[PDB]
Design a protein around this ligand. Structure first.
Ligand SMILES: [Pt+2]
Ligand SMILES: [Pt+2]
Ligand SMILES: [Pt+2]
Length: 195
């Protein structure tokens, strides 16, 4: 059920994200920033169990505040960069995720590394907001992002197969997927753009 319920939730959050992007282009800037802060707040709070309403709210908000990067890279490198990026994200998600659904060996150890990795990304990202890195650094940083988050997709579906995830845990667990998805998309899209 979990591999049928949680997945459905994830895809639903994808739909809501899409609506958030479509609406997001109409959303005036300077109001994007507090939505971003709200996004970080929801992330920190959820993983400090959040219900469906929380998840979908964050889905809409995240769907909105991703518009700047989307429109930027589309308007500098072509709409294809965005599309190819999206499809690529989809494929890596499907393949590596499926591997998560099949491979027996409990990938619970790497949880340490993975965490250390995301935190690392966070560090760089934080630094990046204050003192921006050159394109050369953005490329590397992006590649690392793609790797770490592909790993997080894999690991996540593996834990869906293994760990005693109660029914009620459905939303926040599906949220763990959505973040792993969105983050890959960005780091994979930005990769295509710099090229
Ligand atoms: Pt399944
Ligand atoms: Pt395996
Ligand atoms: Pt979990």
């Amino acid at each position: 059920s979990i591999m049928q319920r949680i997945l459905t939730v994830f895809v639903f959050t994808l739909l809501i994200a899409t609506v958030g992007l479509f609406i997001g282009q109409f959303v005036p800037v300077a109001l994007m920033l507090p939505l971003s802060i709200l996004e970080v707040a929801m992330i920190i709070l959820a993983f400090w169990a959040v219900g469906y309403a929380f998840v979908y709210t964050f889905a809409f908000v995240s769907g909105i505040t991703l518009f700047p990067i989307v429109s930027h890279y589309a308007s500098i490198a072509g709409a294809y960069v965005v599309l190819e990026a999206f499809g690529s994200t989809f494929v890596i998600f499907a393949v590596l995720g499926t591997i998560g659904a099949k491979m027996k060996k409990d990938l619970s150890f790497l949880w340490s590394f993975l965490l250390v990795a995301v935190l690392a990304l966070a560090v760089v990202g934080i630094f990046n907001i204050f003192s921006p890195l050159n394109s050369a650094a953005m490329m590397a940083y992006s590649v690392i992002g793609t790797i770490v988050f592909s790993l997080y997709i894999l690991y996540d579906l593996n834990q869906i197969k293994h760990r005693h995830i109660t029914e009620d845990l459905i939303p926040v667990m599906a949220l763990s997927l959505y973040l792993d998805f969105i983050n890959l998309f960005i780091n994979l899209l930005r990769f295509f753009g710099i090229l």
